[PDB]
């Protein structure tokens, strides 16, 4: 019933644009929206984010997260490894690459989501959430070498999956980090399950 009639460029940068979208609401009334897009995307989606399950025997499973200064937030955020999918890359390979670049972890794909929206009231940005396990007992993951590209500065933080929500609350409580929404959402459902 609803649909786009037109888009108007308001402002373009090297990475992000701001558009004015005209849409038909369901009553047959024309309406406007200020919408944000990435300039970079071709791709099944803009990005991937990796849920990395570190499995070591005789240890808790951990979820592997990254801390990065995020200039939009003006502070440090805890997030799932993530980055944009390069032209002609597959969502899975982007996942394994970014996981390796940001953590040093060599991992295995378990499952891959369809494209999911990041903030659909504001942007069109989408990602593939890619669940990956990490055999933490394999010698290649024994002393993992994070290979950040230019401009990235990433600290790795592994947290036990069985207490993930409580561990994140402590980090917010004490470190004044911002936790990412998808991460928090995952941590919550761990608690809410069953």
Ligand X SMILES: Cc1nn(Cc2c(C)noc2C)c(=O)s1
Residues that bind Mg ion (CB under 5 A): 82-83, 98, 101-102
Restricted to residues 131-150, the positions that interact with a second copy (CB under 8 A) are 131
8 annotated ligand-binding residue: no
Residue 65 marked ligand-binding: no
| Alpha carbon distance 112, 34 (integer Å) | 31
Which one among 88, 149, 153, 174 touches a second copy, defined by CB under 8 A? 153
Give the interface with Cl ion as residue ranges (CB under 5 A).
Answer: 53
Q: Is 172 in the site for a second copy (CB under 8 A)?
A: yes
Q: Provide the 10 A C-beta neighbour count for residue 69.
A: 12
Does 119 belong to an annotated binding site? Answer: yes
Helix (H) or strand (E) holding 53: strand 47-55
Instruction: Report how far residue 24's alpha carbon sits from residue 31's, in angstroms, rounded to the nearest whole number.
Output: 6
Please state, in angstroms and rounded to a whole number, the distance separating the CA atoms of residues 154 and 69.
8
Separation between Cα atoms, residue 103 and residue 92, nearest integer Å: 16
Query: Does 152 carry a binding-site annotation?
Result: yes
φ, ψ of residue 101 to 5 degrees: the values are -55, -45
Task: Please state the closest distance from residue 56 (CB atom) to ligand X, in A.
Answer: 33
DSSP bridge pairs for 92: none
Gyration radius (Cα) of the chain, Å: 19
Helix/strand/coil for 133:
strand
| In contact, 130 and 49? CB cutoff 8 Å | yes
Residue 77 touches which of Cl ion, a second copy, Mg ion, none (Cβ within 5-8 Å per kind): a second copy
1 binds a second copy (CB under 8 A): yes
Single out the residue of 93, 109, 112, 118 in contact with a second copy (rule: CB under 8 A).
Answer: 118
Residue 125 binds a second copy (CB under 8 A)? yes
User: What string marks each residue from 42 to 81 as x (binds a second copy by CB under 8 A) or -?
Assistant: -------x-x-x---------------xxxxxx-xx-x--
Q: Binding site annotation covers 101?
A: no
Annotated binding site for Mg(2+): 82, 98, 102, 152
Annotated binding site: 15, 33-34, 38, 70, 82, 84, 98, 102, 119, 152
């Amino acid at each position: 019933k609803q649909y786009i009639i037109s888009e108007e460029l308001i402002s373009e940068g090297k990475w992000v644009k701001l558009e004015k979208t005209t849409y038909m609401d369901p009553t047959g009334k024309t309406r406007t929206w200020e919408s944000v897009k990435r300039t970079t995307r071709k791709q099944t989606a803009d990005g991937v984010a990796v849920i990395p399950v570190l499995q070591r025997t005789l240890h808790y499973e951990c979820i592997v997260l990254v801390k990065q200064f995020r200039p939009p937030m003006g502070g440090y955020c805890i997030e799932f490894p993530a980055g944009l999918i390069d032209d002609g890359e597959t969502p899975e390979a982007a996942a394994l690459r970014e996981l390796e670049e940001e953590t040093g972890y060599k991992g295995d794909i378990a499952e891959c989501s369809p494209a999911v929206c990041m903030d659909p009231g504001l942007s069109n940005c989408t990602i593939h959430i890619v669940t990956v396990t990490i055999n933490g007992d394999d010698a290649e993951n024994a002393r993992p070498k994070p290979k950040p590209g230019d401009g990235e500065f990433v600290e790795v933080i592994s947290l036990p999956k069985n207490d993930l929500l409580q561990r994140l609350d402590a980090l917010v409580a004490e470190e004044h980090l911002t936790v990412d929404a998808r991460v928090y959402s995952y941590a919550l459902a761990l608690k809410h399950a069953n």
